[PDB]
């Protein structure tokens, strides 16, 4: 019988494997598994005797064989696996007696199976649900012995009747047939913990009509519920689950949530699938409560307890979700919250501070020009620190949590040469905060900031036309600047008033009651994605034309447009650049504004009839 | 201040122990807080003696 | 607090596990008793009455403990009135005790002999309890056989 030695190893591995919570897992000393007396199973010429012997005589060894012991003319040919548990009856025995014997013997067979379940499955190798259930089913065996003794005293007086005996054993037969069904099912391969907790709901429904097997199955389930519910306390009311094994609810890793904690989906009972993410998210949240110091306890904490029809015990999980998720949130709405944190990120990355970067460009021109690999980050951090201080940008407290970082790619992530291609900022992460405001997500956020900085940087380039011509008679350069500025400022008003603030407020208002951290993460994703989409270029055609537009303009606005080669302070090579830039620009301008037509700003770019055809 | 109240509850335990009352530390702790509101102590004794009879009668 | 103290006192009196509406029934029993009574000799004297009839039964130092353990509350009269009016209700060793061979300056006395039949009745108690306990076990498992 190697099965009792192989399944044993699998089921304790299935408790040592995922978790080492609780040290040095025990195993029972070997001698328990191998004596025949720790199993509920084990001289006259009988056929010549009159019936006044026979009936009374056979109930003797039957009454022995009702218990796990040998008979005297009834017998048991040996077990070798063989879970039907056959019984041997003698020749020269009356066949009218024999059929009633065969009516009774299935008691002895199912009994031997029950008690073989007892010796084996009560061990450390099979999980706390099997421990408390094995206690429950070792209960009734003594009542069977009591019955046996109550029959034995009648037998000793010799008053006993086969028909009375048969009549009496009926609730016993029924009762241990109930157990044998659960036991033999758990004996089908395995039932670890929650996989059993199919049966412990489902078998009570399967017996709901019988009205004796029903309350029996309530008892068996009332026993088995307690240890599983007793560890359940430690993720519903506490920061870490004290599973002494690995047999309930959560896989977990040592390192985001998809790593930290994941449901063990058949180690959830017949009842709790719709509660499983409630529990798992709550446990995750309580881990944060603990992670942060905080307070790891619970005022709704009381025993989770089984009931079949009036199944209102599952609302304890809802009451706990509305305590424990909620108390984590009540932290995350006055510290590690979205509020002053997102005000700083809005101030710099979404450039709500429009008085910050005037300093940065008034300072960093020594950076904004030098060839490749000359990157100097302490100088950049000092430029940030000064451009902060001299401005009003100075005033917010998270400016010191802020940093200068570097980006390698000039928007070509879509599918030194300092600053213009390479700026980045970072409001630094904390691991408690990394469940919401986090670097891996702030990558997408830095792409929006690159665009908002770059577009206003080429606005500084275009604005250099104004200061570099205002001899003083020519206006073709300034109406060319007008044709560009009528676009680039009025994309920027859109990119700044419409792309962010509506979308941002769409998230912001939710923060007052947003159900849970994954909901907040969904809002944050949708917000950042919607803005991302509310930006001009973020299309599969990519509106790549805009880069060319801004390119030919930067050659105009800074690289040629310098006091008309100081003439005011006439060989037509000045005007030939305006003509060639106009020839590129006017056509690329047409395609871009046409695309802005076929894909609300365009309506105000036409308005009174501002060209309409370029 | 406060630990004077715990040791008060040690006096008011042990004397209730030698006066062989049926009481326990939860009921003692609340019965002093009822007495601090001025509630009649013989009236409290009348509810306590009858509630232990019903507590058994539920079996 | 006021009404909430009657609420959970009823829960303390209710036994450990139909754990549902009996919790209201018991509250009505409490209110009934409370208000049928309300509409119809200080504490130190009260306890001396109990001090005395302890001190006559035996158990004199316990009686001494009682009065010394509550002369200390001069720096709770209504609280004491609970314990005395509930006093009967409850549920039904030393070597230095009464031993002349130890301690320092023990004075002359000569044979007590009652302090020996005392000691001899204690040992009779510790055999008799464990005989009545053996009677209460043997009847238990034999009854379910005979029934």
Quote the CA–CA distance of C128 and C130 in Å, as a whole number. Answer: 5
**Cβ distance A121 to A130 under 8 Å?**
yes
User: Phi and psi dihedrals of A405, rounded to 5?
Assistant: -115, 175
Q: How far is CA A438 from CA A335, A428, A585, in A?
A: 15, 8, 41
Furthest-apart CA atoms within chain C: distance in Å: 68
For residue C147, list chain A residues with Cβ-Cβ distance below 8 A.
150
Note whether C147 contacts A153, CB cutoff 8 Å. Answer: no
Quote the CA–CA distance of A196 and A377 in Å, as a whole number. Answer: 61
- Among the partner-chain residues C5, C78, C84, the one whose CB lies closest to the CB of B19 is C84
**Cβ distance C19 to A303 under 8 Å?**
no
Note whether B18 contacts C66, CB cutoff 8 Å. Answer: yes
**Cβ distance A247 to A129 under 8 Å?**
yes
* Tokens of residue A183, six digits: 């036991």
**Closest approach of C72 to chain B, Cα-based (Å):** 9
User: Of chain A residues 267-306, which have a CB less than 8 A from chain C?
Assistant: none
Residue C43: closest CA among chain B residues belongs to which residue? B41
Quote the CA–CA distance of A514 and A329 in Å, as a whole number. Answer: 9
SS3 at position C3: helix
Q: How far is CA A603 from CA A465, A589, A598, A607, C50, in A?
A: 27, 16, 11, 6, 100
User: Phi and psi dihedrals of A596, rounded to 5?
Assistant: -65, -25
Chain C interface includes A153 (CB < 8 A): yes
Note whether A149 contacts C145, CB cutoff 8 Å. Answer: yes
Which DSSP state fits A160? -
**Closest approach of A224 to chain C, Cα-based (Å):** 17
Handedness of CA A167, A168, A171, A175 (dihedral sign): negative
Q: How far is CA A32 from CA A471, B41, C71, in A?
A: 111, 60, 62
**Closest approach of C83 to chain B, Cα-based (Å):** 6
Quote the CA–CA distance of C97 and C111 in Å, as a whole number. Answer: 16
Which DSSP state fits A37? G
Q: Report the Cα C143 to chain-centroid distance in Å.
A: 33
Quote the CA–CA distance of C97 and C100 in Å, as a whole number. Answer: 9
What is the H or E stretch that residue A404 is in?
strand A404-406
**Interhelix angle A128-157/A196-206, nearest 10 degrees:** 50
* Tokens of residue A267, six digits: 């180690």
Quote the CA–CA distance of A351 and C35 in Å, as a whole number. Answer: 72
CA-based radius of gyration for chain A: 41
**Closest approach of B27 to chain C, Cα-based (Å):** 6
For residue B32, list chain C residues with Cβ-Cβ distance below 8 A.
76, 79
Q: How far is CA C75 from CA A69, B4, B18, in A?
A: 73, 11, 22
Q: Which residues of A161-184 are buried (b: 16+ CB within 10 A; e: fewer)?
A: ebeebeeebeebeebbebbbbbbe
SS3 at position A89: strand
At CA A213, angle to CA A211 and CA A215, rounded to 5? 75
For residue B19, list chain C residues with Cβ-Cβ distance below 8 A.
50, 66, 83-84, 86-87
**Cβ distance A567 to A480 under 8 Å?**
no
What is the H or E stretch that residue A74 is in?
strand A74-75
Residue C141: closest CA among chain A residues belongs to which residue? A146
- Residue A118 neighbours by CB under 8 Å, 6+ apart: A40, A134, A137, A138, A141
Chain B interface includes C117 (CB < 8 A): no
Quote the CA–CA distance of B29 and B7 in Å, as a whole number. Answer: 12
Chain A interface includes C144 (CB < 8 A): yes
Please choose, from the candidates A106, A175, A168, A108, the residue with its C-alpha nearest in 3D space to the C-alpha of residue A139. Answer: A175
Handedness of CA A332, A336, A342, A343 (dihedral sign): positive
**Cβ distance A284 to A236 under 8 Å?**
no
Note whether C88 contacts B52, CB cutoff 8 Å. Answer: no
- Residue A438 neighbours by CB under 8 Å, 6+ apart: A256, A429
**Cβ distance A14 to A242 under 8 Å?**
no
Q: What was the elucidation method?
A: cryo-EM
Q: Which residues of C52-62 are buried (b: 16+ CB within 10 A; e: fewer)?
A: eebbeeeeeee
**Closest approach of A328 to chain C, Cα-based (Å):** 29
């Amino acid at each position: 019988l190697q099965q009792s030695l192989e399944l044993k190893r699998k089921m304790l591995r299935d408790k040592q494997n995922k978790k080492n919570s609780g040290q040095h897992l025990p195993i029972f000393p070997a001698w328990v598994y191998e004596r025949p007396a720790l199993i509920g199973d084990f001289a006259l010429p009988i056929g010549t005797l009159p019936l006044a012997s026979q009936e009374s005589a056979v109930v003797e060894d039957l009454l022995y064989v009702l218990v796990g012991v040998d008979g005297r003319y009834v017998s048991a040919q040996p077990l070798a696996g063989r879970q039907s548990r056959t019984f041997l009856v003698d020749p020269n025995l009356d066949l009218s007696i024999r059929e009633l014997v065969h009516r009774i013997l299935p008691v002895a067979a199912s009994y031997s199976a029950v008690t073989r379940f007892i010796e084996e499955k009560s061990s450390f190798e099979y999980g706390q649900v099997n421990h408390a259930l094995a206690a429950a089913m070792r209960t009734l065996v003594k009542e069977h012995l009591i019955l046996v003794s109550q029959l034995e005293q009648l037998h000793r007086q010799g008053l006993l009747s086969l028909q009375k005996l048969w009549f009496y054993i009926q609730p016993a037969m029924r009762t241990m047939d109930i157990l044998a069904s659960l036991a033999t099912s758990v004996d089908k391969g395995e039932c670890l913990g929650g996989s059993t907790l199919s049966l412990l709901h489902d078998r009570s429904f399967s017996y709901t009509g019988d009205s004796q097997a029903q309350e029996l199955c309530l008892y068996l389930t009332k026993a088995a519920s307690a240890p599983y519910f007793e560890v359940l306390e430690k993720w519903i009311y506490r920061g870490i689950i004290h599973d002494p094994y690995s047999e309930f609810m959560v896989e977990e890793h040592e390192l985001y949530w998809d790593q930290r904690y994941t449901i063990v989906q058949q180690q959830i009972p017949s009842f709790l699938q719709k509660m499983a993410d409630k529990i798992l998210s709550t446990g995750k949240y309580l881990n944060v409560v603990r992670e942060c110091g905080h307070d790891v306890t619970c005022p709704v904490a009381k025993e989770i307890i089984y009931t079949l029809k009036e199944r209102a015990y599952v609302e304890q999980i809802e009451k706990a979700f509305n305590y424990a998720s909620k108390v984590l949130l009540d932290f995350l709405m006055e510290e590690k919250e979205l509020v002053a944190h997102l005000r700083s990120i809005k101030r710099y990355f979404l450039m709500d501070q429009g008085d910050f970067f005037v300093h940065f460009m008034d300072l960093a021109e020594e950076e904004l020009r030098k060839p490749v690999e000359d990157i100097t980050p302490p100088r950049l951090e000092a430029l940030l620190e000064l451009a902060l201080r001299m401005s009003t940008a100075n005033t917010d407290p998270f400016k010191d949590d802020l940093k200068i970082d570097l980006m390698p790619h000039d928007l070509i992530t879509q599918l030194a040469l300092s600053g213009l291609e390479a700026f980045s900022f970072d409001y630094i992460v904390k691991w408690p905060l990394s469940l919401i405001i986090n670097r891996k997500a702030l990558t997408r956020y830095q792409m929006l900031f690159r665009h908002m900085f770059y577009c206003k940087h080429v606005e500084r380039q275009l604005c250099s036309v104004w200061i570099s011509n205002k001899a003083q008679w020519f206006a073709g350069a300034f109406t060319l600047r007008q044709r560009m500025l009528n676009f680039v400022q009025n994309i920027q008003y859109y990119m700044m008033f419409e792309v962010m603030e509506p979308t941002w407020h769409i998230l912001e208002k939710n923060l007052k009651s947003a159900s849970n951290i994954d909901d907040v993460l969904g809002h944050h994703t949708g917000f950042l994605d919607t803005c991302l989409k509310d930006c001009m270029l973020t299309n599969p055609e990519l509106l790549k034309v805009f880069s060319k537009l801004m390119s030919v303009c930067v050659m105009f606005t800074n690289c040629m447009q310098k006091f008309t080669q100081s003439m005011k302070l006439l060989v037509s090579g000045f005007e030939a650049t305006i003509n060639k830039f106009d020839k590129n620009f006017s056509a690329h301008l047409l395609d871009l504004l046409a695309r802005l037509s076929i894909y609300s700003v365009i309506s105000r770019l036409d308005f009174n009839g501002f060209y309409t055809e370029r | 201040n406060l630990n004077a109240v715990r040791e008060t509850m040690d006096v008011l335990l042990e004397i209730s122990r030698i006066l062989n009352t049926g009481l326990d530390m939860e009921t003692l702790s609340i019965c002093v807080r009822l007495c601090e509101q001025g509630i009649n102590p013989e009236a409290l004794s009348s509810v306590i003696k009858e509630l232990r009879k019903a507590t058994e009668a539920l079996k | 607090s006021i009404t909430q103290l009657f609420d959970d006192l009823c829960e303390a009196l209710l036994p450990a596990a139909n754990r549902k509406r009996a919790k209201r029934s018991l509250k009505k029993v409490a209110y009934n008793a409370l208000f049928t009574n309300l509409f119809q000799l200080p504490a130190r004297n009260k306890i001396l009455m109990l001090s005395f009839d302890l001190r006559v039964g035996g158990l004199g130092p316990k009686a001494d403990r009682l009065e010394e353990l509550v002369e200390e509350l001069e720096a709770v009269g209504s609280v004491l009135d609970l314990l005395v009016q509930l006093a009967g209700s409850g549920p039904p060793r030393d070597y230095f005790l009464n031993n002349k061979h130890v301690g320092r300056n023990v004075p002359y006395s000569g044979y007590d002999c009652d302090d020996l039949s005392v000691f001899e009745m204690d040992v009779q108690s510790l055999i008799s309890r464990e005989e009545c306990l053996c009677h209460s076990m043997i009847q238990e498992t034999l009854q379910v056989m005979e029934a």
